[PDB]
Amino acid sequence: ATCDDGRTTANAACCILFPILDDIQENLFDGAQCGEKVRESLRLTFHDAIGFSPTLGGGGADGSIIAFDTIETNFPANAGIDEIVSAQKPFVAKHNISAGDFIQFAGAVGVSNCPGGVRIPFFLGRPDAVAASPDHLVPEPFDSVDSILARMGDAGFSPAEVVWLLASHSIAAADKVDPSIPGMPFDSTPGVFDSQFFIETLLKGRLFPGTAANKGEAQSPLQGEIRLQSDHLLARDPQTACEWQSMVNNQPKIQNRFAATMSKMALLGQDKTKLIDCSDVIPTPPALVGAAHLPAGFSLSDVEQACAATPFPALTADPGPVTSVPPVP
Ligand code: HEM
């Protein structure tokens, strides 16, 4: 099919997505930047979709977190999610797209803004949300590895898939984990979708980045960087450690596994065969910037070898003394 200006798309239905693309790039993503709203939008795709259980209920990737926002944004596990829900609501109302479609579309478009990012498949046609998600379906950073893997598994994700989805934390920061110091990222490159998150979580912890250890927080190897306890444990757990370590300096795998598993997550509670493939609408992301490295002042001795099958790859450290991670703008 073709759109008004002759651009090819596999289905004519996808043409309605282009004005939505332009509007969000300009008015949600601050001129197609990989910034705060991109990160919050990626996070929202998860908080919307993970509200899904074959036995416990929830319609999954159905836009319920927007359509029933007063209920869902008040779940303890959804702390801080109100701001991005509130920012996205006018776009949903203004455009001719369901809330479930908009959330996943905004996430895929956002990721395409990030250097090293990957194009996530996108399907159009999710119905309006039917009911609010049940509470207690969103994993929390203080949950045990077994609890987290059981909840994600109930939703349909294997431990390896949990690792692949956690590539999202390569472009991520926290406001609620430690309320005193908002905007500390989970890796040293929160604006670059790269392997630094998997490297840095495997380093021996050194400090608590604020003035307090908070619930759900582990020791961080870097000042200005925050480490979730869930990430700390998943990096090292036998169920996940070899998968975690394999992401290190493996950009093609990070991209490929993230795209595939995000697509699967965006379809929770949905039937892809009743939807329309509009993947070709998502822009090509900019290429990776920077390279895999240990932070400056670190050596391979700082790695906590958790994978038994294979040793950590022999990365080199950035030059100079150990430095802090600047807060995200
Ligand atoms: C599997 C268990 C997970 C846990 C326990 C977890 C936990 C967290 C926490 C505590 C935050 C910080 C919230 C705050 O204080 O502001 C966060 C941020 C974030 N999460 Fe995860 N997460 C998980 C999985 C995922 C998945 C599957 C995605 C996929 C899209 C994702 C995407 C993000 C993003 C992009 C941010 C950054 C938000 C921002 O920069 O504003 N997370 N996560």
Ligand SMILES: [Ca+2]
């Ligand atoms: Ca939902």
Ligand SMILES: [Ca+2]
């Ligand atoms: Ca990064």
